[PDB]
C-alpha cells in the first residue's frame, strides 16, 4: 500500500500538471488497465483511490518475485 | 537530426490527439439524464437510510 498509494500520489499530481486533454490523451491510456472505471477527475486522490483495481495478492506477487527463474516465469 | 526527430514527435502528438478526438466523437455522449436518474434514485436511498441510521 505504501507503493500503491505513492503511485497514486504521483499520478494525481501528474494529472493536475497536465491539461485535461493530456489527461484523456496521454495519462489515461496508462491508467486504464489498473482502473475499474475511467474517471477524468483522477487528479483527486479520492477519485483515483476509489477507482483502482484490486492489487496483486502479496502471496502471489512474492512467489513470482522470489522465484530465482523470474525471467522464465514471466 | 534534432529537428528531424522533433517533427516526428510533434506529428505523433497530432496523430494521438486526432485519434482520441475520433474516440470521443465515435462514442455516443452519455445521456446525463440517464445517469442523473440513477443518481437521484440513489440519493433517495441515501436519505431514507440516513433517517434509519439516525433512529
Amino acid at each position: 500500500l505504501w507503493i500503491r498509494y505513492g503511485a497514486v500520489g504521483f499520478i494525481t499530481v501528474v494529472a493536475r500538471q497536465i491539461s485535461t486533454a493530456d489527461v484523456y490523451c496521454k495519462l489515461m491510456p496508462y491508467l486504464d488497465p489498473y482502473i475499474t472505471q475511467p474517471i477524468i477527475q483522477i487528479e483527486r486522490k479520492l477519485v483515483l483511490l476509489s477507482v483502482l483495481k484490486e492489487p496483486v495478492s502479496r502471496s502471489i506477487f512474492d512467489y513470482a518475485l522470489r522465484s530465482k527463474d523470474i525471467t522464465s516465469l514471466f | 537530426d534534432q529537428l528531424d526527430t522533433q517533427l516526428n514527435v510533434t506529428e505523433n502528438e497530432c496523430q494521438n490527439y486526432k485519434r482520441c478526438l475520433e474516440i470521443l466523437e465515435q462514442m455516443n455522449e452519455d445521456d446525463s439524464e440517464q445517469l442523473q436518474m440513477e443518481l437521484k434514485e440513489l440519493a433517495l436511498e441515501e436519505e431514507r437510510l440516513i433517517q434509519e441510521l439516525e433512529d
Binding site: 485535461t20 484523456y24 | 517533427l7 497530432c14 490527439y17 478526438l21 466523437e25
Partner: peptide, 29 residues
C-alpha cells in the same frame, strides 16, 4: 535526406499549429 533545415522549421510551426488546434478540439469533446 534532402529537405532543408529552414523548410523543416516551417513544418514544425505547421505541426504545432495543428497540435494546439487538436488540443482545443479535444477540450470541446
Amino acid at each position: 535526406d534532402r529537405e532543408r533545415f529552414i523548410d523543416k522549421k516551417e513544418r514544425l510551426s505547421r505541426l504545432k499549429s495543428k497540435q494546439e488546434e487538436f488540443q482545443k478540439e479535444v477540450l470541446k469533446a
